[PDB]
């Protein structure tokens, strides 16, 4: 899942277009054979970039063309981590519907549920729980989503978790 | 021209947001009660630098403007971080373009680029900077500092940190006021009066190397040279110059507002003529850019480009002039890390000096045709804006009026630029003047785990910043001249994310704790250059009237598009459009 | 009006004498060798404020005066307390009166006075303050800060002090320069380059609330919200305004010396027109005072008067205009806590705007007769100097301590002169002090021997007392993208009564919690809420009038004869209107 | 005794060879001492005036005169790298192991400034290579601390 960084003209353009939200250019590039899992120097693939910047249609195109749904960056984080962290609900569903590892841990033991929890993204928390997220998973410091809810004073999130 | 006053400050190892939020906003909030100020703008950068430009009404006296700015800044100095205050803040009243470049080479190739830059900084720059008419002087290189390059494996082996190194340097590179034997008021009958000399600043790598960090259980000694490499080297390593392909340094000189260009230039030459007889052997002054005869080439790569890729573009530009244009070009003075828009890893500039006019017969061999051919030749360089020019469409500021934040402002900008692109009949090349967000390494310190282990937050943050960013500790004396001492990690221990975990901090109980025990990290995007306009977050947008349209029509359209942006986003016209 | 430069500084929590002896004197001792200086005066107040006014000869270039005063001020800057330097000392060249007031209200009622004041401070004031010809801008309210309101019971329960709170806020509300991965000089061949981002300033009450103060032995956590209420609130709470009885804030704008009034007013309106389209809903600019169509009412109570009492008198004044003068008066913008005497709890001002010239026919509906009637109606208000006037023949006298006599002796001498002046109604009318009377103050003595025996440090004692009862500016934070201050202070109910002193605990070097009562004693005494100085010596300003058809000259002559009989070491001078 | 003593101290300090020969001829005390206990020989040794040194020694200058902190003309010559002077002093009887008030010897001082030929000459004349100062340090310890490996060879 760690895709190697070959700054090969079309992969590099694909990385740029996925970032900037250029749906058309992405379609063109994919049809011209661009590596759908080209990675930049931090291990981000076009699916990471689209998931971060909230570009739903590009996420869908990329997965349709064989994007690794569980691509890891150089610190172990996946596109679903990014989408959960930044509140992109519709992306979170598409990713999970396409086989994203709902319990993936980055190098710090942090899961998408932890990230969604920490920023109070409640609809994301529910979706992830719906897909099998381990409500009791602990990061490297022993913290659960519930612990996050207590530290942040987020009673609505504590309630969802029960 | 409306006179402009510039404030510059620096914060070693700071990111753009840190600079903006501890320096730029503080200064801007205190730029009140100053007469005749038309507008203010700032950039806060990932190089740890800020530049705030205050532009005054036409006919303002630039002396009075500068004085008023300096005085308000003086009253705001106590509000700035000590790290910034101690670098020196400057305030200049100068033209934004260069009057001349003084180049320096060594013809015997016996001095490196770094040596040449130190020589210029230590022996030439200050006298030039005091010359009447000289408004700003940029060194194309850096003065030496004493560089303490720390090794985290050796620090950990002896149960030490960068905090212990800093403390020892402050204690043992010290200049002590110790009074006098027979000092006043004295006893009756005193025969002897003499100064007491105690510690004095260190002057050499050897002396820094023998700073005593600790004495072990068994009485063996740990010297600074046992945990660090000790060498003279630049205070920074951001700017490197070449003259016709050879190592160089020099001075870029900007004319003070209202000074006489010919008189200033002649005073500079007279000052260089006093220095020349004392140059070390091989050193020589060249004159690569005296303001026909000359032009510049800008090199601007996207944010995130390395020193190495900027260099590769400049080598292509230089090569073109020294081969394809060798009949017209006498010299090229190329600077990597400084550009038309100032300091950055992704920018460069080349100053080009033509052979005598008389030896360039033909319209095709005059400055205009040469720059046009060069711009065409450079128009296919990948992922770089490269153009050749001499020192007008529109200049638009998009403005955050409601606390929206950088991310929303970038979205509004992109909405406006998308809409502009759909009217190619009215507007052409509607673009941002600044830089795009790039990946940054976000590290969270876990306060609970730090407290549980007895590791101080101050020790953690000093360790991280000193090792990965560098820290100015105090001064020392190099060949009779006061200069700076910097501690930083040696390069090989601060290159990659896994290196974070080889740095250890000492807990209150004496145990060494690695960074990995109390921190976590992730990648995210943020800005390498945050802009402000009249004290508010801003993004500058340039562009022009499409062919056969007036500037007014194109401006009117820009305003119409701007009226359809998300709530809380305003705009203003600046520069040529004001 | 000869040109004046004003130096202003602020020391939060400081009494008048502390301001005078750690700030005012240090600055004034450098105010010599300044060209065309006629005289200098200063006030040092128990609001923790100082103002030093330097008055220059007519025709002096105000730029040059300002430059020369600031030059001398810089000699004193490194000797001032850090707390004063960090508030930002100001040096202004303005007229002493307001050119206009810009009022701000919320016609949806969806913003409190405090919200409006923050909005104005955060989105409007700076731009106005940079506008050419604006000499001074006064906010009628306060910008938000992040307020941490400590509870001493909770702090003591966890063996914490305000020092621990302050330390934690500096450590956990921090903006860290952390360097770069792959920065220069690199290992050659390096491709990765990225900024390291570590701690960054906090932005919300929620983040401040989860600052971690300590981890117990059992592993439980004490967070800052467990010892403190956390909310946005004014840097200070001294200035409150109303427009026609509804919540308001505003900007009082004074003209820069020599600047053009028409032009500057116009530049101010053009700047306000840029701001207007971005206001939140309900927010509206109003124009309660453009300099005649306008006048002011001054309210001055005795020193010792609470905010509530000044409000009661302001309510009477506004009531009068809105009932009795409702056919003539368009609007009243009333400000409690600020007035002609500047900032103070026993002072207010009302800015009154009249209806059109055309709608007020007759002499009796013109500003002179309105103000005459107003002053007359307010002449019966008890224990308050209230008068109405638009905008010569008094005198302005300075009694001066010229021998180190001290404040108490100078007061006695002043009372002697005032009683003697009272016996000459034929030459002198309404001879009176311009300043404030002494009021009770709470004197606390720290016992050094006890502190040393218990192992409680003086710095911890002082920070605990000052932070709890006075408020301490800790560091900055970012509120909605703007840098703002962070203050720690006791919640109100734990700093109201003398016995509350004993509820505050300090931690000894051995970890024991020691109440303030173990190492301190207290008593009531009197002292000054406003100490005055004239040309660098303690002084007391006395105003009055020549009696009907005596010249100011004969009036001044008698004051001088009466002054010649005062105790040794007490001198005098003439200032202001009496100086020529 | 002499007003001429004071002039000899100054002439020796400032290098004036003729003036020294003259004042000697007219009877100046060759062992005149200033307020810090420096003799003409101390001054000529510190400031490197070889011919003044030789001239003073032939006129009976005391080769082991010590200042008020115990230092001798050989300390000064050795510390400041005046090789020819070190040899002349030693040739004229200088105590090669003289210790000042801090237990510092001419070899310690030469070793500290890296004056290798002087270290060699001192050692020929019988310098105690293991002499320790008040802190217990030897010339060898000095060489180790300063990282001067050429000096550490020789000791």
Coordinates of N, CA and C in Angstrom, one line a residue, chain B residues 13-146:
Chain B
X13 N 13.7 29.5 12.0 CA 13.0 28.2 12.1 C 11.5 28.3 12.1
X14 N 11.0 29.6 12.0 CA 9.5 29.7 12.0 C 8.9 29.5 10.7
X15 N 7.7 28.9 10.7 CA 6.8 28.7 9.6 C 6.0 30.0 9.4
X16 N 5.4 30.1 8.2 CA 4.6 31.3 7.8 C 3.6 31.8 8.9
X17 N 2.8 30.8 9.4 CA 1.7 31.1 10.3 C 2.3 31.6 11.7
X18 N 3.4 31.0 12.1 CA 4.1 31.4 13.3 C 4.5 32.9 13.1
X19 N 5.2 33.2 12.0 CA 5.6 34.5 11.7 C 4.5 35.5 11.7
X20 N 3.4 35.1 11.0 CA 2.3 36.0 10.9 C 1.6 36.3 12.2
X21 N 1.5 35.3 13.0 CA 0.7 35.4 14.3 C 1.5 35.9 15.5
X22 N 2.8 35.9 15.4 CA 3.6 36.4 16.5 C 4.3 37.7 16.2
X23 N 4.4 38.0 14.9 CA 5.1 39.2 14.4 C 4.3 40.1 13.5
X24 N 3.9 39.6 12.4 CA 3.2 40.4 11.4 C 2.0 41.1 11.9
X25 N 1.0 40.4 12.5 CA -0.2 41.0 13.0 C 0.1 42.0 14.1
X26 N 1.1 41.7 15.0 CA 1.5 42.6 16.1 C 2.0 43.9 15.6
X27 N 2.9 43.9 14.6 CA 3.4 45.1 14.0 C 2.2 45.9 13.3
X28 N 1.5 45.3 12.5 CA 0.4 45.9 11.8 C -0.7 46.5 12.7
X29 N -1.0 45.9 13.8 CA -1.9 46.5 14.8 C -1.4 47.8 15.4
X30 N -0.1 48.0 15.3 CA 0.6 49.1 16.0 C 1.1 50.2 15.0
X31 N 0.6 50.1 13.7 CA 1.0 51.1 12.7 C 0.0 52.2 12.5
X32 N -0.4 52.7 13.7 CA -1.4 53.8 13.8 C -0.8 55.1 14.0
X33 N -1.5 56.2 13.6 CA -1.2 57.6 14.0 C 0.0 58.0 13.1
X34 N 0.2 57.3 12.0 CA 1.3 57.6 11.0 C 0.6 58.4 9.9
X35 N 1.2 59.6 9.5 CA 0.5 60.5 8.5 C 0.7 60.0 7.1
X36 N -0.3 60.2 6.3 CA -0.3 60.1 4.8 C -0.1 58.7 4.3
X37 N -0.6 57.7 5.1 CA -0.4 56.3 4.7 C -1.6 55.9 3.8
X38 N -1.3 55.5 2.5 CA -2.3 55.1 1.6 C -2.8 53.7 1.8
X39 N -1.8 52.7 1.9 CA -2.1 51.3 2.2 C -0.9 50.6 2.7
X40 N -1.1 49.4 3.2 CA -0.1 48.6 3.9 C -0.2 47.2 3.3
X41 N 0.8 46.4 3.0 CA 0.7 45.0 2.7 C 1.8 44.2 3.3
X42 N 1.6 42.9 3.6 CA 2.7 42.1 4.2 C 2.7 40.7 3.6
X43 N 3.9 40.1 3.6 CA 4.1 38.7 3.4 C 4.8 38.1 4.6
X44 N 4.3 37.0 5.0 CA 4.9 36.2 6.2 C 5.2 34.9 5.6
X45 N 6.5 34.5 5.6 CA 7.0 33.3 4.9 C 7.5 32.2 5.7
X46 N 7.6 31.0 5.1 CA 8.2 29.8 5.7 C 9.7 29.8 5.8
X47 N 10.3 30.8 5.2 CA 11.7 31.1 5.5 C 11.9 31.8 6.8
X48 N 10.8 32.0 7.6 CA 10.9 32.7 8.8 C 11.1 34.2 8.7
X49 N 10.6 34.8 7.6 CA 10.8 36.2 7.4 C 9.5 36.9 7.1
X50 N 9.4 38.2 7.6 CA 8.3 39.0 7.2 C 8.8 40.3 6.5
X51 N 8.0 40.7 5.6 CA 8.2 42.1 5.0 C 6.8 42.8 4.9
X52 N 6.8 44.0 5.5 CA 5.6 44.8 5.6 C 5.9 46.1 4.8
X53 N 5.1 46.4 3.8 CA 5.4 47.5 2.9 C 4.3 48.6 3.1
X54 N 4.7 49.7 3.6 CA 3.8 50.8 3.8 C 4.0 51.8 2.7
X55 N 2.9 52.1 2.0 CA 3.0 53.0 0.8 C 2.2 54.3 1.2
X56 N 2.9 55.4 0.9 CA 2.5 56.7 1.3 C 1.9 57.5 0.1
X57 N 1.0 58.5 0.4 CA 0.5 59.4 -0.7 C 1.7 60.0 -1.4
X58 N 1.5 60.1 -2.8 CA 2.4 61.0 -3.6 C 2.6 62.3 -3.0
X59 N 3.9 62.7 -3.0 CA 4.3 64.0 -2.4 C 4.7 63.9 -0.9
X60 N 4.4 62.8 -0.2 CA 4.9 62.6 1.2 C 6.4 62.7 1.3
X61 N 6.9 63.3 2.3 CA 8.3 63.3 2.6 C 8.8 61.9 3.1
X62 N 9.6 61.2 2.4 CA 9.9 59.8 2.8 C 10.7 59.8 4.0
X63 N 11.5 60.8 4.4 CA 12.2 60.9 5.7 C 11.2 60.9 6.8
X64 N 10.2 61.7 6.7 CA 9.2 61.8 7.8 C 8.4 60.5 7.9
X65 N 8.1 59.9 6.8 CA 7.4 58.6 6.7 C 8.2 57.5 7.4
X66 N 9.5 57.4 7.1 CA 10.3 56.4 7.7 C 10.4 56.6 9.2
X67 N 10.7 57.9 9.6 CA 10.8 58.2 11.1 C 9.5 57.8 11.8
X68 N 8.4 58.2 11.3 CA 7.1 57.8 12.0 C 7.0 56.3 12.1
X69 N 7.2 55.6 11.0 CA 7.2 54.1 11.0 C 8.2 53.6 12.1
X70 N 9.4 54.1 12.1 CA 10.4 53.5 13.0 C 10.0 53.7 14.4
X71 N 9.4 54.9 14.7 CA 9.0 55.2 16.1 C 7.8 54.3 16.5
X72 N 6.8 54.1 15.7 CA 5.7 53.2 16.1 C 6.3 51.8 16.2
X73 N 7.2 51.3 15.4 CA 7.7 50.0 15.5 C 8.5 49.8 16.8
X74 N 9.3 50.9 17.2 CA 10.0 50.9 18.5 C 9.1 50.7 19.7
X75 N 8.0 51.3 19.6 CA 7.0 51.1 20.7 C 6.4 49.7 20.7
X76 N 6.4 49.1 19.5 CA 5.9 47.7 19.4 C 6.9 46.6 19.6
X77 N 8.2 46.9 19.6 CA 9.3 46.0 19.8 C 9.1 45.0 21.0
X78 N 8.7 45.6 22.2 CA 8.5 44.7 23.4 C 7.4 43.6 23.2
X79 N 6.6 43.8 22.2 CA 5.5 42.9 22.0 C 5.9 41.7 21.1
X80 N 7.1 41.8 20.6 CA 7.6 40.7 19.6 C 8.4 39.7 20.3
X81 N 8.5 38.4 19.8 CA 9.3 37.4 20.4 C 10.8 37.9 20.5
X82 N 11.4 37.5 21.6 CA 12.8 37.8 21.8 C 13.7 37.3 20.7
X83 N 13.4 36.2 20.1 CA 14.1 35.6 18.9 C 14.1 36.5 17.7
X84 N 13.0 37.3 17.5 CA 12.9 38.2 16.5 C 13.6 39.5 16.8
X85 N 13.3 40.1 18.0 CA 14.0 41.3 18.4 C 15.5 41.2 18.3
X86 N 16.1 40.0 18.7 CA 17.5 39.8 18.7 C 18.2 39.6 17.4
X87 N 17.4 39.3 16.3 CA 17.9 39.4 14.9 C 18.1 40.8 14.4
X88 N 17.5 41.8 14.9 CA 17.5 43.1 14.4 C 16.3 43.2 13.4
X89 N 15.5 44.2 13.6 CA 14.4 44.5 12.7 C 14.9 45.7 11.8
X90 N 14.7 45.7 10.6 CA 15.0 46.8 9.7 C 13.9 47.6 9.1
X91 N 14.1 48.8 8.8 CA 13.1 49.7 8.3 C 13.9 50.6 7.2
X92 N 13.4 50.5 6.0 CA 14.2 51.1 4.9 C 13.2 51.9 4.0
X93 N 13.8 52.9 3.4 CA 13.0 53.8 2.5 C 13.7 53.7 1.2
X94 N 13.4 52.7 0.4 CA 14.2 52.5 -0.8 C 13.3 52.1 -2.0
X95 N 13.9 52.3 -3.2 CA 13.3 51.8 -4.4 C 13.2 50.3 -4.3
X96 N 12.3 49.6 -4.9 CA 12.2 48.2 -4.8 C 13.1 47.5 -5.9
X97 N 13.7 48.2 -6.8 CA 14.6 47.6 -7.8 C 16.1 47.9 -7.5
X98 N 17.0 47.1 -8.1 CA 18.4 47.3 -7.9 C 18.9 48.4 -8.8
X99 N 19.8 49.2 -8.1 CA 20.6 50.3 -8.8 C 21.8 49.6 -9.4
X100 N 22.5 48.7 -8.7 CA 23.6 48.0 -9.2 C 23.9 46.8 -8.3
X101 N 24.7 45.9 -8.9 CA 25.2 44.7 -8.2 C 26.7 44.8 -8.2
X102 N 27.3 44.6 -7.0 CA 28.7 44.5 -6.9 C 28.9 43.0 -6.7
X103 N 29.7 42.4 -7.7 CA 30.0 41.0 -7.6 C 31.5 40.9 -7.1
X104 N 31.7 39.8 -6.5 CA 33.0 39.4 -5.9 C 33.3 38.0 -6.3
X105 N 34.5 37.8 -6.9 CA 35.0 36.4 -7.2 C 36.4 36.3 -6.7
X106 N 36.8 35.0 -6.6 CA 38.2 34.8 -6.5 C 38.8 34.2 -7.8
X107 N 39.6 35.0 -8.6 CA 40.2 34.6 -9.9 C 41.2 33.5 -9.8
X108 N 41.8 33.3 -8.6 CA 42.7 32.1 -8.4 C 41.9 30.9 -7.9
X109 N 40.6 30.9 -8.0 CA 39.7 29.8 -7.4 C 40.1 29.3 -6.0
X110 N 40.9 30.0 -5.2 CA 41.3 29.6 -3.8 C 40.3 29.9 -2.7
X111 N 39.2 30.5 -3.0 CA 38.1 30.7 -1.9 C 36.8 30.2 -2.4
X112 N 36.1 29.5 -1.6 CA 34.8 29.0 -1.9 C 33.7 30.0 -1.9
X113 N 32.5 29.7 -2.5 CA 31.4 30.6 -2.5 C 31.1 31.1 -1.0
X114 N 31.2 30.2 0.0 CA 30.9 30.5 1.4 C 31.9 31.5 2.0
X115 N 33.2 31.3 1.7 CA 34.3 32.1 2.1 C 34.2 33.5 1.5
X116 N 33.8 33.6 0.2 CA 33.7 34.8 -0.5 C 32.5 35.6 0.2
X117 N 31.4 35.0 0.4 CA 30.3 35.6 1.0 C 30.6 36.2 2.4
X118 N 31.3 35.4 3.2 CA 31.8 35.9 4.5 C 32.7 37.1 4.4
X119 N 33.6 37.1 3.4 CA 34.5 38.2 3.2 C 33.7 39.4 2.9
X120 N 32.7 39.3 2.1 CA 32.0 40.5 1.7 C 31.1 41.0 2.9
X121 N 30.5 40.1 3.6 CA 29.7 40.5 4.7 C 30.6 41.1 5.8
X122 N 31.8 40.7 6.0 CA 32.6 41.0 7.2 C 33.5 42.2 6.9
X123 N 33.8 42.5 5.6 CA 34.7 43.5 5.2 C 34.2 44.6 4.3
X124 N 33.1 44.4 3.6 CA 32.6 45.3 2.6 C 31.2 45.8 2.8
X125 N 30.3 45.0 3.3 CA 28.9 45.3 3.3 C 28.6 46.5 4.2
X126 N 29.2 46.6 5.4 CA 28.8 47.7 6.3 C 29.2 49.1 5.8
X127 N 30.4 49.2 5.3 CA 30.8 50.5 4.6 C 29.9 50.9 3.4
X128 N 29.6 49.9 2.6 CA 28.6 50.2 1.5 C 27.2 50.6 2.1
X129 N 26.7 49.9 3.1 CA 25.4 50.3 3.7 C 25.4 51.6 4.3
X130 N 26.5 52.2 4.7 CA 26.6 53.5 5.3 C 26.8 54.6 4.2
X131 N 26.9 54.2 3.0 CA 27.2 55.2 2.0 C 25.9 56.0 1.7
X132 N 26.0 57.3 1.6 CA 24.7 58.1 1.4 C 24.1 57.8 0.0
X133 N 22.8 57.6 0.0 CA 22.1 57.2 -1.1 C 21.7 55.7 -1.2
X134 N 22.3 54.9 -0.3 CA 22.1 53.5 -0.4 C 21.0 53.2 0.6
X135 N 19.9 52.7 0.0 CA 18.6 52.5 0.7 C 18.5 51.1 1.3
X136 N 19.0 50.1 0.6 CA 18.9 48.7 1.0 C 20.1 48.0 0.3
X137 N 20.7 47.1 1.1 CA 21.8 46.2 0.5 C 21.5 44.8 0.8
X138 N 21.4 44.0 -0.2 CA 21.2 42.6 -0.1 C 22.5 41.8 -0.3
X139 N 22.9 41.0 0.7 CA 24.1 40.2 0.5 C 23.6 38.9 -0.3
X140 N 24.4 38.5 -1.3 CA 24.1 37.3 -2.1 C 24.9 36.2 -1.5
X141 N 24.5 35.7 -0.4 CA 25.2 34.8 0.5 C 24.9 35.1 1.9
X142 N 25.7 34.6 2.8 CA 25.6 34.9 4.2 C 26.9 35.0 4.9
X143 N 26.9 35.9 6.0 CA 28.1 36.0 6.9 C 28.3 34.7 7.6
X144 N 29.5 34.4 7.9 CA 29.7 33.2 8.8 C 29.2 33.4 10.2
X145 N 28.7 32.4 10.8 CA 28.4 32.2 12.2 C 29.3 31.0 12.7
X146 N 29.4 30.9 14.0 CA 30.0 29.7 14.5 C 28.9 28.7 14.5

